[model samples]
Target: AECSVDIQGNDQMQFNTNAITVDKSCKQFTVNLSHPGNLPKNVMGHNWVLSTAADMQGVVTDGMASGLDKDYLKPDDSRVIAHTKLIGSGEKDSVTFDVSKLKEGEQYMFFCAAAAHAAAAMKGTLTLK
Candidate 1:
């Protein structure tokens, strides 16, 4: 199995896909992100962060204070399941997490925590197979 998925973010503050699938057979899962927008990160950047649907709000709230230098994520934040580095136009990033962190019948949320992007239109659900 490929055990990976490619996600895209654009300047319009949107993600190309709203759903992700993770095969249970994978020992590790990877998320590959690409930003096609031409704007600088400070203006319009994106990062892929995964957590439980319940933890999404808390992580996003705390990440706002973490700032871009930290990819808008608190360092060593246990609430984060997995995350990719913040990327600007034409840039890319990838984050791999052990499949053991996920549980069956649990709902996971994935989103971009760049400023107001998550509240805007850069969030989605991840499902386990």
Candidate 2:
């Protein structure tokens, strides 16, 4: 099975999908992201970050402090299960994570750290199969 999936982000701060499926049999899980807009990164940027539902807030708060250089994520933050690099219009990025880091029955989700994107309309979820 393929270990990666692709997603698109538009200028409206919207994600193409609301969910990602990860096969339990996979050795690694990857997400490829694209920004299909023309705006500059400061105005409309997006990133893919993963974490348990319960850990979302904390991870996001700390990530905000990390800024764009760190892809809006803290330095080696353990709360971040996985994340893609920040992307601007027409740019793309990918991040691969160990499948073993995921646990059956645990809640997991994906979100963007572009200002209010996640809180507004740039959020998605993940389910392990």
Candidate 3:
């Protein structure tokens, strides 16, 4: 079963893949994040965020209101099902969340919580298989 997903963000401000499929056979899942550019974390840092497609906007907006100190993610935001720490070029991080949190048929999206990055179309869908 496909229990996990791997993704990356770059200086161009987008992920290599826009779609993710999590095999339902697994009780939990992980997201491995990486930055393959020469940019710094504060300059062009990136992270992985998971939430409903509808919640994506609010998540990004709130994350922008915060600082990179919190990985550009709102502190304890329940809307964020899972997320990776803010990372820079040549650095990597990973996050895991219970698969039970996902509801089949729900339209879920994953994207970088960095300021305005998701708006640049740096987002994608995650579905349970």
Candidate 4:
């Protein structure tokens, strides 16, 4: 089975891979998130947040207000299709999302909700194959 994902979130608020491919054949897709820096979570935490492009700002805005305890994400946000827990330096996390939740050809983006992370443009596009 193909996991259909790859991710990179670094200390500089940038992701090495800005895109993801979801295999239609797979009942679910898995996103493997990695942080290669040596900083701590509060200083430079990173997580993968999946939501519509239009909802990006809304999610981030609310997330910032939600604070780190909430993983920088709004509590139980319906707009969020999926997300991983915040990881510190050299830490990793993965989340499997049901492919059925995605719409064909729809645009999806992932970003780090860490306060200034988005300002530095830590985001990416995702597509289904």
Model 1 spans with C-alpha error above 4 angstroms: none
Error of 2 at 78 (Å): 0.7
How much is 96 displaced in model 3, in angstroms? 1.4
lDDT of each: 0.92, 0.86, 0.90, 0.86
Model 4 lDDT, full chain set: 0.86
lDDT of 2 by residue, 79-98 (tens): 88988878899889999999
Pairs that collide in candidate 2 are none
Answer with 1 or 4, whichever has the higher TM-score: 1
Where model 4 places Cα greater than 4 Å from the true spot, the runs are: none
Cα RMSD, each candidate:
1.0, 1.3, 0.9, 1.3
Which ten-residue region of model 1 has the weakest summed lDDT?
A: 36-45
TM-score pick, better of 3 and 4: 3
Clashing pairs in 3: none
Model 1 backbone overlap count? 0
Q: Write the per-residue lDDT of candidate 4 for residues 23-116, one digit (tens) a residue.
A: 7788988888988977888888999999988899999999999999999999999999999999988899999988888897578888888887
Could you tell which candidate, 1 or 2, scores higher by lDDT? 1
